[PDB]
Write a protein that binds this ligand. Structure first.
Ligand SMILES: COc1ncnc(OC)c1C(=O)Nc1nc(C(F)(F)F)c(-c2ccnc(C(C)(C)C#N)c2)s1
Lengths: 424, 150, 71
């Protein structure tokens, strides 16, 4: 509980941990749980104590009589090569609250970008991934892409059972099941709003098709909005590979961080300059003789001017043409300045930490997806996957383990401890 | 390409100009291999080439997906005109053309596209132009912060 | 930009706070009266402003304090 971080403590608490642990030599201390139902390992997992965690997960005790207390046994070393045999007793998500499911599902610590790089956690995520999660995730991407192309074709070929029944029933069933899935996912408590938006798009599709079946011709709006939103939601599934991961997540960073506040201030610009210009206008005796007519007209022209399609004509039937021209030049200049300010905000600030934030968000979303798929599978298939092996380390321990080969040329040591004398 | 074009010119197939002009363009592009010899030209040519291959291509893919989705959306929002040319977003390819011109800044924003829900159509169009603007900004950061180091 | 923005904002906030400080009457200002009382000397009882802190680096046998019983 009191272990904070090396920069503020010099990490004596890890030393005292080792001392007190191997002094009372047994699993008495690590096995008890507190009134929150957590063990010291699970506890350091619940909080964000990375140092204590990195110690407990990979703790090697090389003394003979206390070797059974370790959670990493170099069992195979021959030279600069070696095969550390980590432990997966309460880390492998096969318990109520594992260290891994805690480290991934605890979003109120804000340090996981480091904790999910620890000794067995990182490679266990990697192994679960390459075993089943890559396959299930790519399958989900393919199903969603086909559902999206079917929404697109249904939208294009709206009525101005070949095209109607097949596609409409398929989108109905897919949308209803994914909506129930996302909704029950909401009921658990830029990280996980994709549940919100997926559920919203699915309900949009289902409402659109139900209204199409019903006596309401206002279904096309819902349908086309659902299509544009599903194509937006493809952003979730383009988190996968390194290029698309970085691309999608920095697009998200732009969209949410900066362009939104830029849009807010620009809409304030629009409101103010629109009311000003429409207040400067004079009614034409040929009212269409000046495009800045009603308020909404002026706002439209100002929009087009920002994008570069409006027209600058000094004869807007003004009463003070110089002042009106001044206000209009002011608006275009200031929105130009807001464009420049946005450019600097996204070209100087994020560019430093974009590489790191992209990677940490990629990693956290991969952890969440892997652990979610892990639940989506039945007990028998999960036991059929069962990352890790068996390994004898004590008189009779035979606790699960996870081999990790390694190579280190720096620290040469006469090997003294191993499980197998002969390297396999 | 050049040899096939000139052979077809000699042959009895007068659809050769396509091959010939495309070959001239491809050669003027292959001038890159020779303008990556001199030092200033080496740096210039190869940072152009790294832009082209690294980033504008993925930008083009995602922007093509933008175009396709927004084109089918807009063309599914349109209503037939009884003066069918009374709305530029007519057939699909027409809508894609206008959306391209909007991205380069040549299209026309007229709210009266013979829509049935003009507010929603205008919303989708503003969404497309804003999102392709955002893709331009994202591309700009990807080529102005990352590559500039190495 | 990151540093200049914060320094100019901090200057502005200080100016606004001290501004408002004067905009209020004497009675209300005395009703605010940041700080508390505290006895340090034989009879000092000057104003003071508590600040809790946490430092794990420098361990020292504490020798000086006003209230031996920590509250
Ligand atoms: C890759 O995306 C696509 N691929 C192919 N076709 C497409 O459109 C048909 C699309 C697409 O962008 N769809 C969209 N729908 C909507 C909505 F109106 F629901 F909000 C979009 C929207 C609107 C406003 N602010 C955002 C932010 C900035 C938060 C983001 N992000 C997103 S975007």
């Amino acid at each position: 509980t009191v272990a904070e971080d090396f920069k503020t403590q010099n990490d004596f608490v890890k030393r005292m941990y080792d001392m007190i642990l191997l002094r009372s030599g047994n699993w008495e201390l690590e096995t008890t749980r507190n009134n929150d139902g957590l063990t010291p390992l699970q506890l350091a997992a619940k909080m964000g104590k990375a140092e204590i965690l990195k110690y407990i997960l990979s703790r090697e005790i090389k003394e003979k009589r206390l070797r059974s207390l370790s959670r990493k046994f170099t069992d195979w070393a021959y030279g600069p090569v070696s095969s550390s045999l980590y432990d997966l007793t309460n880390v492998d998500t096969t318990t109520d609250n594992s260290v891994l499911e805690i480290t991934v599902y605890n979003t109120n610590i804000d340090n996981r970008h480091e904790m999910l790089t620890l000794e067995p956690l990182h490679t266990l995520l990697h192994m679960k991934w390459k075993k089943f999660a890559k396959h299930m995730f790519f399958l989900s991407f393919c199903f969603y892409f086909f559902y999206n192309i079917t929404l697109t074709l249904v939208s294009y070929y709206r009525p101005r059972g070949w095209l109607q029944l097949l596609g409409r029933m398929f989108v109905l069933i897919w949308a209803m099941c994914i909506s129930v899935k996302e909704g029950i996912a909401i009921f658990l408590l830029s990280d996980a709003w994709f549940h919100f938006v997926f559920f919203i798009q699915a309900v949009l599709v289902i409402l659109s098709v139900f209204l199409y079946l019903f006596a309401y011709k206002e279904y096309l709006a819902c349908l086309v909005l659902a299509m544009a939103l599903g194509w937006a939601n493809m952003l979730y599934y383009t988190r996968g590979f390194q290029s698309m991961s970085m691309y999608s997540v920095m697009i998200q960073k732009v969209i949410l961080h900066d362009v939104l506040k830029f849009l807010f201030v620009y809409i304030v610009f629009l409101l103010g300059f629109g009311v000003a210009l429409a207040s400067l206008i004079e009614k034409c005796p040929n009212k269409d003789c000046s495009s800045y007519g009603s308020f909404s007209d002026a706002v439209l022209e100002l929009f087009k001017l920002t994008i570069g399609l409006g027209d600058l004509n000094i004869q807007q039937n003004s009463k003070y043409p110089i002042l009106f021209l001044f206000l209009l030049i002011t608006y275009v200049i200031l929105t130009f300045v807001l464009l420049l300010n946005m450019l600097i905000a996204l070209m100087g600030e994020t560019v430093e930490n974009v590489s790191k934030e992209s990677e940490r968000i990629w990693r956290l979303q991969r952890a969440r997806t892997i652990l979610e798929f892990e639940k989506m599978l039945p007990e028998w298939l999960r036991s059929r996957f069962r990352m890790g092996e068996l390994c004898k380390v004590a008189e009779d321990d035979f606790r699960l383990c996870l081999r990790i080969n390694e190579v280190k040329w720096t620290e040469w040591k006469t090997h003294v401890s191993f499980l197998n004398e002969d390297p396999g």
